[PDB]
Amino acid sequence: MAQLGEMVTVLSIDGGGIRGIIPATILEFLEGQLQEMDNNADARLADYFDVIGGTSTGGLLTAMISTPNENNRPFAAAKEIVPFYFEHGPQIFNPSGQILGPKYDGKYLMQVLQEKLGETRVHQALTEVVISSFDIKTNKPVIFTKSNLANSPELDAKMYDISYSTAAAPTYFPPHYFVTNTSNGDEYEFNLVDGAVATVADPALLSISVATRLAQKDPAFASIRSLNYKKMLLLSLGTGTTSEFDKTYTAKEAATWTAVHWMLVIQKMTDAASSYMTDYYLSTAFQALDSKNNYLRVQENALTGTTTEMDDASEANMELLVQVGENLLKKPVSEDNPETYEEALKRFAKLLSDRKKLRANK
């Protein structure tokens, strides 16, 4: 069939705590477009993307739109995500007041994840999912994927363990300990923290890489088997970075900072660096293959005020976050390219819809 048909589609969502409201707003717009284009209100993101990767709240989002419900359909529609944040956000980011330990005990977060995810396991995901985390015990990143588990049943973990882990940010939530089982029945232990610690606050390159590897044995992904980025369609969503005119710093003032001052901001800096670097790696690859337009990165580069914190679940801040999300749609994709993200996304939507159709026709 046409080149479009054989293409591999990937969606990636950055971490960012409540800032997940931003990519959620974008995904809401995208799923709506797809539903409108295919005249099917039942259309869900997972029906168009072969791979969906997420880190932190991006991972929670991934779990919700990829976990099968009783009807074997995505547990949640994109439009349900922001409301999830407004309703549970304040209870998830509710200060425990503990002298020692993190800012939040994470009890409520796990409660809700169990409530909605149930006992679903990653092998049941409706598409290939890639959810990141870092094991502070083995000192290695642990990437939960849907495929491959055939041999390693220890990685076929429960969605709520995976979801809590990917969002367990140091100093914010308690790292997570849960147990799984090997082939021989032996116990397999996990000691996980946020995927940002694993260097993948922006998991788009990790997602494409997982797909490339799968192509070594999954005929479905045979098309990008030899790193052919020309057949790769990638939508990568960020949760925004701090404006240089906001909470940013000079070497002069950082002189007298203590370790706690550095811990209070070091995470935001690496998240911003991850957004920059990952985008740099990908733009380099896609451009080198004259496929610049195959990769759409939707990111806000100028967050100000309360909006910068992944911690603020106040009514006023979540509302501002919805606003940056709505406004992002109105911003342009690049410089001297008047095209807005909204139009680019519509184009992306059309490609997803057409591909699904071609996959059906042939």
Add this chain to the structure above:
Amino acid sequence: QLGEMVTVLSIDGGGIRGIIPATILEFLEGQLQEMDNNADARLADYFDVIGGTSTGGLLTAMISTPNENNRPFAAAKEIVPFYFEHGPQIFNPSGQILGPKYDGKYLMQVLQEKLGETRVHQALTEVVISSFDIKTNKPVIFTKSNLANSPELDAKMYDISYSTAAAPTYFPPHYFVTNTSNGDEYEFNLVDGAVATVADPALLSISVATRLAQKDPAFASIRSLNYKKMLLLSLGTGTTSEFDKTYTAKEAATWTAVHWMLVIQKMTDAASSYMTDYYLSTAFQALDSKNNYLRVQENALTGTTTEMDDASEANMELLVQVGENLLKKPVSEDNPETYEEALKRFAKLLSDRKKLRAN
């Protein structure tokens, strides 16, 4: 201004490689149909002139010849399928000991089946189809106009279509007869338009239009070579990559005529693409109208895709692929804009111009 502009479409020759421009035109016509919410929209409704050489000329004849409803005989999306179905039968080795690679009997059969007895004067737009007369030793350009005085040039579309594609060593040159005013017989002995130097007929098309402007008020706007009012879409069938079937003087130093005849046509075809584009870019740029001229050409064909008579399933498929990939390639040097976007822009101009021209 837009409404005053003259629109021209030009398509290079290239045998089976016509699949590439066909692919591009399919994308273009679709855009126009979408833009004007009219699936009945055809290329000929937006171009005042359509020029073609070889399979580019066949393409021109098919989208310009009127059917029973007086509409373009074929939609752009029908061209590639025409190649996949008739291509293998057109380029079917006769295995004859003497003469061309193909007897061309099937090619003429299909051209007759599809164009019937239509005549060039019936074209839905101004058409420019090239050929070279080996007897008079001069190029013969078939045009929709000027026939008033010279009825000898109002030839049958299938004679014109076969002629423009009758490449030396590939198909037998074509002999057909026409009639003058006094009823006298007029003889043609034609071969491919590539031999006439117009493998890329874009400048020839523009020139025919300029001349028509000397007596056709419709073309009065480019009457004095005002390229500022010229909108031109020129489509190529690709050229061989320098890392593929290309050659060094060293190996060529000992070549005989056998080797040369195997490669000369492709070389001049590629040169025509380069030179014609150079002439045009020079003219448009000189009038600060660079964007008025869109040339869609693939400069790196490899493997089987360089051959103009390879109608194998696998090669036609690769040709459709270079066509689809060409759509996403950058228009130039460091112009990140892809041909796809440029064509969309061109489409919008065509659609806008047509509306104005109405009300």
Add this chain to the structure above:
Amino acid sequence: LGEMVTVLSIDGGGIRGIIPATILEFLEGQLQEMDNNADARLADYFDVIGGTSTGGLLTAMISTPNENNRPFAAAKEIVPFYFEHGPQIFNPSGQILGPKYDGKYLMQVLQEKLGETRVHQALTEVVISSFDIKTNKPVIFTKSNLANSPELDAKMYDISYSTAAAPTYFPPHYFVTNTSNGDEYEFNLVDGAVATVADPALLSISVATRLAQKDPAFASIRSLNYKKMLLLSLGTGTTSEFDKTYTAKEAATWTAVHWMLVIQKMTDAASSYMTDYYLSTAFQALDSKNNYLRVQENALTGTTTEMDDASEANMELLVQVGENLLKKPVSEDNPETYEEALKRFAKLLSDRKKLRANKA
């Protein structure tokens, strides 16, 4: 961005006002589309609107409140106003001794349109220029300050006729106002071009700067901070050097009446050039080049050069230069067209208005 002060400025030029009107029509449309509100009007986004001559008439029409307290006219109504009333405004009186037009019709329509509205009622800060031939000084009508000087709170039709009363074209205007003590205040005005502000861009910016000395609303550009200044300046075009332009050789044989016949077009063109030069200098010096958008046609030809040719054929050509100007690049070497730049400007205006209301 929400801190920024927005200013719109329109040059004079008689019927050539059709050009900037065409540009403003495109702009208001963009703003209406952007905010999904067909009721959106230019005055809702600009804190200051300055105009001279027909630029001043334009200003009066889009800033004068109607019965609903909304801009009396939508941008898209201006060009039609010219096509309908233009021929009657520029209708030669044939009165051997005096201006080419008696200006009666012009005042008639201005009175019919603006009613008894007074400047203090403008929906935004307006700046309309004129020159008083009796006091020998420019008279700038503004919506603010009138608290102390009620003599400047003149009727909009008096101000509008005045700003457009070009010497040799229309009769200067006389009208009376009243001071605090009730004493009579007389005006003897002619076109603002005579006051040298054929291009009132810098005058508008300056009025805003001064207002900033007492209006907290304009506190942000109080100390000449051009970084917080967003300015859209529209011209009515200048003659192409290949058209009705002249050599020293030929002008050596000119009479004084020959000079009077072309001197106004020369100074208008110079005003466009110089004012733009002053502003580009200031904005560039503050690394805010993009804060200032100047839309001007520099190559008018044929009938198009004349400010009083209201024939159907010429007004049509004017709509054409306006439409074509949209597709031209904004700066030498900078492919971006005015159309795209205006869209960008539109977006900024829309965004700023949102931020001004969101936190309110």
